[PDB]
Amino acid sequence: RFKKHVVQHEETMQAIAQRYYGDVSYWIDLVEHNNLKYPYLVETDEEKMKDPERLASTGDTLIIPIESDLTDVSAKEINSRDKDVLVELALGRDLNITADEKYFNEHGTSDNILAFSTNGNGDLDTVKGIDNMKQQLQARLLTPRGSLMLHPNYGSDLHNLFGLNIPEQATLIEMEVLRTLTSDNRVKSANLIDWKIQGNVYSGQFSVEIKS
Amino acid sequence: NEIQDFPAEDVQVIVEGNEARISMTVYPIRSFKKISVSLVYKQQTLQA
């Protein structure tokens, strides 16, 4: 895992390692992660134009490992070249089945609702990073608790919670959604920020803390 | 309370030898026979 950062006006590479990891001594291993040539951070972009991929300048992003992965040579090699592909690899890639986004939001808790799609040319669509998470959460939430053919106790009882719209039912729905969302270890916490009623319609929203 | 009301002004009586004739007015207790209702259902909000 890692933290994101950006190059500030005339910040030296020493300064970063000292502020995040405590000891200045660690900058030496820290430059290898960002694959930097000797002028590790340099102020001017027309100087970055010298050989753009091997430098960072003012306003560019940087990668900051956790201290356990700081010394790993494999983490060094991977962070050297992947650069922005970090986030995608770290939160996953899989096929996109949200083909009909307008449609699956008209029949949830019913089956047969999702479907493969095509993006690019001649290849099934795929989703990555944050949208990988939007897909899996939306599907998982709209799946009943014992309906996948292996590893059951997956999904929700949202199909079971339809009731007289009195507030106890609404807190019950809130708790089920929060349990649903907090099941995946990749998400830290969820909390409600609004629940709202319109006769026979529930509405509400939840904030989820995804790891960096 | 056997009568609701009566106009005290409206008592007229005439007597003629052995014969008398009387007239008066009474407000009887009024009933309450019909009730109509206009019952409406509305949306409502409940919130966090």
Of A151, A169, A168, A152, the C-alpha closest to A160 is: A169
Of A55, A64, A57, the C-alpha closest to A22 is: A64
Of A206, A199, A195, the C-alpha closest to A170 is: A195
At a CB cut-off of 8 Å and minimum separation 6, what does A146 contact? Answer: A152, A153, A154, A155
**Quick one: tokens of A202?**
């529930």
Q: Does A194 contact chain B (CB < 8 Å)?
A: yes
Q: What angle do CA A195, A129, A56 make, to 5 degrees?
A: 120
Query: Do the beta carbons of residue A60 and residue A7 sit within 8 Å?
Result: yes
Of A49, A36, A33, A115, the C-alpha closest to A82 is: A33
Question: What are the phi and psi torsion angles at B27 (to 5°)?
Answer: -90, 105
Distance between CA A140 and CA A186 in Å, rounded? 14
Method: cryo-EM
Question: What are the phi and psi torsion angles at A124 (to 5°)?
Answer: -60, 145
Distance between CA A136 and CA A125 in Å, rounded? 15
Distance between CA B44 and CA A193 in Å, rounded? 20
Query: Do the beta carbons of residue A101 and residue A53 sit within 8 Å?
Result: no
Q: Minimal Cα–Cα distance from A134 to chain B, Å?
A: 25
B48–A195 C-beta distance less than 8 A: yes
- Minimal Cβ distance to A192: which of B43, B45, B48: B48
Distance between CA B20 and CA B43 in Å, rounded? 71
**Quick one: tokens of A20?**
């995040």
Question: What are the phi and psi torsion angles at A196 (to 5°)?
Answer: -155, 145
Query: Do the beta carbons of residue A79 and residue A120 sit within 8 Å?
Result: no
Query: In chain A, which residues have their Cβ closer than 8 Å to the Cβ of B43?
Result: 198-199
Q: Which of A169, A196, A202 to mutate to test the interface with B (most CBs of B within 10 A)?
A: A196
- Whole-angstrom CA distances from A152 to A140, A146, A176, A185 are 12, 5, 17, 17
Q: What is the DSSP string of A103-143?
A: HHTTSTTSSS--B--B-SSSSB-EEEHHHHHHHHHHHHHTS
**Quick one: tokens of A106?**
């008209």
